[PDB]
Design a protein around this ligand. Sequence first.
Ligand code: 39V
Ligand code: MG
Lengths: 222, 231, 195, 211, 244, 240, 233, 235
Amino acid sequence: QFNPYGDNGGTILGIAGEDFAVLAGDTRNITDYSINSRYEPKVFDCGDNIVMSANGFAADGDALVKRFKNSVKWYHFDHNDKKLSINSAARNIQHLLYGKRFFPYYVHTIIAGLDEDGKGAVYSFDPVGSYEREQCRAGGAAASLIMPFLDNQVNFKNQYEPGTNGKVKKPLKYLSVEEVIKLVRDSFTSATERHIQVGDGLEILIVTKDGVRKEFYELKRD
Amino acid sequence: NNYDGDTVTFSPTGRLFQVEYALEAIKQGSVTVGLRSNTHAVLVALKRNADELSSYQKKIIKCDEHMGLSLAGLAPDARVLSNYLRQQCNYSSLVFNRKLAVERAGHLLCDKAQKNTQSYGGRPYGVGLLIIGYDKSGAHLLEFQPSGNVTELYGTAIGARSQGAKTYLERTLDTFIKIDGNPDELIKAGVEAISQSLRDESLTVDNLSIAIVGKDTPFTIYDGEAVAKYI
Amino acid sequence: MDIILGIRVQDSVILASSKAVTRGISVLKDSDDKTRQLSPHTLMSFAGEAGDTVQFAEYIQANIQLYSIREDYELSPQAVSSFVRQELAKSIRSRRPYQVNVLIGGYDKKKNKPELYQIDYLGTKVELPYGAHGYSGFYTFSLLDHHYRPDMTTEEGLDLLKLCVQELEKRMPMDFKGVIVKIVDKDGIRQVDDF
Amino acid sequence: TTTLAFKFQHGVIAAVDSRASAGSYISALRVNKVIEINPYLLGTMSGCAADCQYWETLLAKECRLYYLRNGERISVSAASKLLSNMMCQYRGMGLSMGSMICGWDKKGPGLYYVDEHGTRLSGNMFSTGSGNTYAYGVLDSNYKWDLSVEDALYLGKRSILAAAHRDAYSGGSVNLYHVTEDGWIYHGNHDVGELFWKVKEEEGSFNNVIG
Amino acid sequence: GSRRYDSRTTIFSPEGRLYQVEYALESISHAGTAIGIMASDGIVLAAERKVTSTLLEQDTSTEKLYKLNDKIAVAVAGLTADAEILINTARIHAQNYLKTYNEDIPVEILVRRLSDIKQGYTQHGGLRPFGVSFIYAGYDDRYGYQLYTSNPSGNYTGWKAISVGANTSAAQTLLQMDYKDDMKVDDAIELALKTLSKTTDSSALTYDRLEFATIRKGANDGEVYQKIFKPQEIKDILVKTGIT
Amino acid sequence: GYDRALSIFSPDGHIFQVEYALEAVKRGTCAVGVKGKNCVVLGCERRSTLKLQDTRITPSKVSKIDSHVVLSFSGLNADSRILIEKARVEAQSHRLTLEDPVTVEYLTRYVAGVQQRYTQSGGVRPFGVSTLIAGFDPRDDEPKLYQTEPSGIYSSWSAQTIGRNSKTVREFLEKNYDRKEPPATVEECVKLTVRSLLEVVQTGAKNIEITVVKPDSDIVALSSEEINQYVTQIEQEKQE
Amino acid sequence: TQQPIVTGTSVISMKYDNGVIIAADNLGSYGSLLRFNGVERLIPVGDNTVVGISGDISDMQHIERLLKDLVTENAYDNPLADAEEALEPSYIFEYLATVMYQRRSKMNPLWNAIIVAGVQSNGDQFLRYVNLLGVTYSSPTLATGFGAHMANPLLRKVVDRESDIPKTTVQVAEEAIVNAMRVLYYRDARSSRNFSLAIIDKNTGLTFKKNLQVENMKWDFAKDIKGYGTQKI
Amino acid sequence: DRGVSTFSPEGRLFQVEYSLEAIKLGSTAIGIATKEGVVLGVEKRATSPLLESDSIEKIVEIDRHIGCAMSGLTADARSMIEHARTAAVTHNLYYDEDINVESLTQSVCDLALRFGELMSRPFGVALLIAGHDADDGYQLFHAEPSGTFYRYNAKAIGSGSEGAQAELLNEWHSSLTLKEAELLVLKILKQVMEEKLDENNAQLSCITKQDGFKIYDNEKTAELIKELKEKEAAE
Ligand SMILES: *[C@@]([C])([C][O])[C@](*)(=O)[C]([C]C1=[C][C]=[C][C]=[C]1)[N]C(=O)[C]([C]C1=[C][N]C2=C1[C]=[C][C]=[C]2)[N]C(=O)[C]([C])[N]C(=O)C1=C([C])C2=C([C]1)[C]=[C][C]=[C]2
Ligand SMILES: [Mg+2]
């Protein structure tokens, strides 16, 4: 019997800063125990200062991104070159996904950018369109490996202030882009060690008011 | 006379009067000029207002990053035809990862307009279009008529009093074709061309509309204080 | 839903219907009224799959109310029961059938007679002196076979009905949270608020 | 999920948890399971998140159009029915959506339970989700019509807490709403970790747990 | 295109009339007269066949009176072919109702249905209307004995006594004169025939130029019988009433 | 399908088919609507050219759309049945989807929308019918009276008349009906409705039909004798 | 939904400094039966592109006809059909990728794995994969079926990353491809000795080599192997 | 007869031009745009004194940030309004935001030329669409049955349009307040109306960023009418 779905592995990671956002993802593409590509871009600049990644079944992911990029193009045509806000993009993507509620795009999607007040924004989706704005989100194969680390190191969960002994929490001080990129690189290095579908390369897309910037880092190829 | 009731009827001399009447709507429309060099292509359009309280009707429409047009006649028909071009330019990109050739865009418009001239019930399009674009064979300018006839040109003009601008371009042919790597000078030649079609009124800041596309220049429209430089 | 009973006495029809509604392992409601008035002298109780029951009942209600307005006339219980049967018989061969069993209790003003019709989800109609759907009849029909007379009063009908509910409450494993009882006679439809 | 909602003297209380699961994995610590349809209408969410979000967001579109056509706000009864009718179109197609439509209209406060089977029930108290049984225990033994706004808010809060503790698929935080005739009023996000220890000490409950 | 040849059958005149309906009524005015008379104990239907021949097989012929079901019958005035289209539709509606409700269709409901079909042809579809006027004779247990008429406009009305087809103006005046409310079937039979005998364009009214029918509770006990008269039976009633 | 555009604009900006539909309404029998302080009354003319009529079974001029709303009309009788049916279906459809009966304003807006649709749809002609739609909204004691016409426009009226010689009875209503103090009782409301028809009707015998609609689904049709008593009292006061 | 009947095995390919190489054997298998021995599974499109196809042959012949029709259609009203507006490898791939993903979305896939190899207008190497699921990816080396498991490891020793492409000559690349084809003949039970090889170079254009054979095979050591454990004779 | 989508020898669609004549017969509607808001006002024109004038609804809400006035065959406007409301709320569903006034107008105007032998004829009604959005601020559009729409600083449509438009030509300036605009609409309405203007036969409305679209009470308008009379008597 024909199986229309597949699993191309990979892992993605979005973190929202005070006035910036990052969306990262490994560049490895796989089927079963084989490597298709060591460098196959997975995170895309979709225009209007928005970055997007649909991780899981690559065919469905590429189709979704292609369709959303197309939605942005037609938004400009239909609404006098108005900029598509990150909240408006998120709602648009919900409808793209739920339109195939009974034959789902088999992907976990994440977009990142800046809200209309200039603050960093990440939005996270499920395969059938349910979404919400979040501060931190890892998606894909090693999502369960990475998310707890981020609960601990980004939102300071289970961390208290010494001497008080569990009475006073660690205060939620904001993170700089340099600090976030460290947590991203350590997150992927750790995921690469313990997950066979993660490796080869890491590509990070950083979003600020100045635009979209890219950073690439090597990962273990085993 | 007896043979102008619908588009499905030839006259005794082999004329299609409904198509000719649709052609008449273009002559009533405001003037628009098109011209190109080897590097860039430029549209210049005289916008028309209803009165002093009203805005100036937009004339230029973007179809893709590398293609767009200016209109003269029934504006809603231009919206339909430009929407069709947007879809066709987009079908070429999504399916073939290919920017639609300006010549092929003209062929598609011709064939769309033609179907309306041979069938009962419908009507011809009541608008003329000047399509500019930059593709793999350089800069291009097309003139569309709702009879179906599409023509590739160095320069042209359509609308009321368009003959004056068309004569100017016919003289200036050898000069403006050579304006390579100089967008501002090519626009100047277009603004000077459209000026030959003006009477009583002159080019003001909210009157003039300009668009350009080229080698390293996406299709962009200039309105308002952005065209004060060229007045 | 679970249990719906019906009994036709001398001059009225009495319908008793359970109050429970269950989702998963939790009883969400213990005061549900599993019935719709189709016309002033015609009442329909229902039981079957979740959702389908109310949708079907309301759809029937709307159609009879439309007939009443159009003709300025109340359809006989027999006519209504035949309409309902055809809709269920039509439904059973549909893509997704409506899984609903009904009792129709009505008082025919022309003949001056009470009438009770039992119709299952297949479109199986029978006129009866007393009726039930599902497992309800397994416990109650022996009592009704024994005690039922056609010349019974409304009060005797209610007493025989109380005996039926008591037997159900004793020998059924499920808690159906008592019943709402309604009486259909020449004067119309009224609910017995204490049962 | 666990969600609950109940009518009382001073309107209706609505309380939900904030967890989301993908098997044993807790996929979200803080999801919003209440939708603000309009200033006087709320909707709770339980089941498939996508279904809950899509159809209740669409319900809000349809309730807004009602206001534009009629120049009056939609009733809670009508709003619940529009939603139950949406469920009946996708009857058997595999949706999963359990919700309470809470609000205040001309008949006073209203509360309707609606699920994917097209069920539509009116009542004074409801609770949906994997942890509804735990919530019902507290609600049933403590509920009165004569509750004060302060005591009612606490009951809804404490009932979710009970469920969050025992139900593995309920937790994260508690979101409280109070619906009045001037509209709904949000009463905050309450972390269950902190709330548990607080309630344990102040109430003396959860004696078996060590803290 | 095709527009050139469209007569536009469904339009108003400047005066607010429907051309085709008015012209259809003009057609019907040349058709053989049909009369219906309602009595307390039954209904009479009498109708005149149009200029017949001696070689027409009368006993097997039917152009005027048709049976819709056991309780309802109609008299036709206009195009017979058009009438048969409508009659077969009405026969189906009556059976659809019987299947649905397990009761015989009330007369008015059947009449309204046929009249709604006629109406549709005057408002949409661009087709010519049916050039037919019906007299409906029927019985049901709500209103008892009932007479109705419908015409190409799709408008219907109830009557105690009525005529359609030719010379309705003259026929209605004669009926209005001699009709009384306490009248009986045997008296109504006589009135119907006498009216036709005076209004007819023929020289003399004979059995071979008539179709006749009665709907009586003159059936054994509480039930209704339809009687489509045979040629010999029409001959006998003509002698009985003293016309031939 | 038959798609022919029958209702179209003329050079002077008129849709003749819609205007000729109004002429069909002008031909129709007179209908009148008067709302009192706690009621609405609908009066209707019956032309006495048709005797030997069976009044038991003949279609009545006033039609119930629901238990709380009624509809009378002037114009083509066959056309009116189609609007009435559609209205009755929409009334049950509203109860089924929204769980409230239609408001009088909503029902009017629907019927008016149907009439409008038949003025710019292909292959169809406009309804040769104007309607008076009256009743009381659920749990409301304020009277409602609306009018519709072939074009599809509708509006609310304190009192209104349509049909043949409606110009005359409207003239009567305009001088006799006071807005500051409307017919306080049912009697006064019916009396004013009968008086208005007596300007046009001819004989006050079986030519006048009256239907009184009161709040909370209280609708009754007056009989011949009841109306005849109003006719008697009016003329006896007039002899002075 | 179907099952593949007549099938072609591995298609292998790689980039080198001035272009791309692609290869595939000439066998059409019918299950374990080696039915058809003269099947061409590399299909040139113009003089700048070669499409290599594995999987169901009937679907391959269908795709072959779509490409033939694509060339015809591109020439229509196109004075620059053999110049600026000629078909690019990227156009051909995207078309096929669109078709493949549409067909899988209708639950009626073309049961194939396809590699489009070619050189673009600007001289850039093009090498991209697509299959019955509509899944696409690009890499310095690409291979289908068994080739993915056995050829890629060998080809990746020559070009391990992007920076190794300019350092790899056509002689070294062809040598690696030919060795890979030999290894596949040793170890793939649905492979044949006969194969075809195509080189698309930005300077020398399209070179299409037919009737190639696997040679220099090692079998002599087999004579010494006796029994399955304890047997000496 | 002749096609519905036929061109005249001058290059105009007969039916579109004829619908414009129907709009000239309609009751007057005026719109004035300012930096403090956009004002919409209409002539009700009741055919009889028994007609309850408050049921005349010629000013209509499309969304909280968009209002609409009509003139001509007002029955034709109902389907246009329904489409506008649906388009406005549907865009809010898809994009979680208010829709631009221009985009809403463009959606309404797309219906216009969908006629032939789709609906059988063009609409016999013109619309003044007024609203506010964050990108282009306060806006006033004039939507015709031709499918064309012009933006206006001030515009009058209906029977007294050319007389009112000439008056709007002189009176409008870029520094008008909301109060000044209100009186100006009342002034010009009073000038072109047959009957004497009062709170019962004329209606005002406005759209502001803060409060959104509001139809004015008869008591509120009555005061503005009284304020107008006094300031005209002041010189
Ligand atoms: C309980 C917390 C779960 O038992 C409750 O029922 C919630 C309700 C809820 C409502 C709105 C938003 C989120 C949750 N349900 C879920 O958490 C469901 C449970 C479920 C899993 N499979 C399934 C379920 C229910 C019915 C059929 C099948 N969880 C989900 O729907 C899963 C698919 N959701 C996610 O994974 C989400 C992710 C990731 C995510 C979401 C939802 C929202 C925002 C960002 C990311
Ligand atoms: Mg690894």
